[PDB]
Design a protein around this ligand. Sequence first.
Ligand SMILES: CCN(CC)C(=O)c1ccnc(C)n1
Ligand SMILES: CCN(CC)C(=O)c1ccnc(C)n1
Lengths: 269, 268
Amino acid sequence: GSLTEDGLSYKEKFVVRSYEVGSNKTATVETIANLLQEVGCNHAQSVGFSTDGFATTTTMRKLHLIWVTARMHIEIYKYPAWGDVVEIETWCQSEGRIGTRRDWILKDSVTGEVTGRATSKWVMMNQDTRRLQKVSDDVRDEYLVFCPQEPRLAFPEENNRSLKKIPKLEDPAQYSMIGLKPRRADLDMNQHVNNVTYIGWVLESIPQEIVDTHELQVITLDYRRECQQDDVVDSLTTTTSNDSQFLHLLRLSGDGQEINRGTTLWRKK
Amino acid sequence: GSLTEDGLSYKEKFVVRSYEVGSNKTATVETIANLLQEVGCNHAQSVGFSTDGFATTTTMRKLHLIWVTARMHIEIYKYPAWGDVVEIETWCQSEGRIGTRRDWILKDSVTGEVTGRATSKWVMMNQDTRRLQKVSDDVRDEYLVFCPQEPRLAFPEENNRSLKKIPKLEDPAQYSMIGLKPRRADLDMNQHVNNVTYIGWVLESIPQEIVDTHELQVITLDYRRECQQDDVVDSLTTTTSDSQFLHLLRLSGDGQEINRGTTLWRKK
Ligand SMILES: CCN(CC)C(=O)c1ccnc(C)n1
Ligand SMILES: CCN(CC)C(=O)c1ccnc(C)n1
């Protein structure tokens, strides 16, 4: 992987592995999300962020701040097959005091065609109190050095899917998968649950018949609270709709505290 | 990745990913096991096995037979750090009518030093009845074309750890992790639970303080029965001692054994 000629974006190629694919021998959306995180991590390191596991700027370390994900949105047109090479381009943008955004474009390395796109919103958090905050002037200034200064969006469109408000699923859910717990392979190098695990947990309550007859086209996930290493999660799903659409809710098994909400759009194979 | 000059082994390099490492920023043993499986798949494809999900020979397809893992044994000297390049060499050998063996050697790409080694035993199974079988003459003949004909062992030593008999853990277990279930990411392209998931489940009953203060040096796992997509597993562990443990995976309900194993850990 490497920064592009202008130093304002990063590209990396990946060969899809045998264990990375599902029943149709193409990459799962979790494999795609892991690749997005990997190229994101390589881009941050290339532009001078810390290499200790928390990816921070100089001003962030001084103020004890970290980035946390608020939303992840992925749209796939074609899932790469086992053995195919996928090329992913990523870049970041400042969003004033709100937070920052990371965007991605996936391409087939052979044809050069766009096979997917993704966008993510990140918000500042004090690492000690876990309280959200605004992005300060010094952090906005740091982002000018490695982000394009004119807008560059993976999802440019007027009222596009990546910016839609997601409602809260009301009981009873049409489908559910209960007692979901993370194991050590679900944790990152800082012992926090990997953001991709939540995608897998959301998907657990989709009936197997939908997965067998449909391909996932779009997934939008809001991150509200973190699932701790000793927490237990319930994944809930209700149909809201050729195309099938679902509303999702992840909550703690005991008290029902919300951890994530999302929506998925599936198209018949 | 590619076959070596003689066409009797296969090599592939991998860059350790950010999500592939644990708290000490080095690859987990599950990441290592996934890389071993990946280079194994690439080797089978390069020597003409089927590309439909079940790596079979021509005679195997005709007889409705598949390979199934009986035992996995891994010894790690140094876990590669995040961003390091690890080179893995793999090869297979016929073991008469018993089954076949796949061996691996892991090396640091920069120093060229051996950082680990692994071996696995595979047994024939009829895909329809799920009954274990012996390896027939036609399958032994197919293996002569891509396996070294003189012995080549990752674990050559007399009476080495990879060949030890593993006892059955007796209740009560010292430690346990109950209600373990596979999710879709735990399944392979054929909708069977990935062999590496069982390693993670075994490790779930090791106390976190052992993981925080020790490095895993050796793991030997026997595979007895598969965990289905709708099954629930209990992971049990008892100290037998370096720290050494005896492990048992069993179905949550009836207590049917699925795996047994042993781990050896060194203080950091
Ligand atoms: C938390 C850091 N990560 C995860 C790898 C990002 O994707 C990201 C977020 C904000 N800003 C930048 C440059 N990178
Ligand atoms: C099931 C096939 N796999 C997993 C990819 C092997 O490692 C293997 C086993 C036996 N023989 C050969 C050539 N390869």
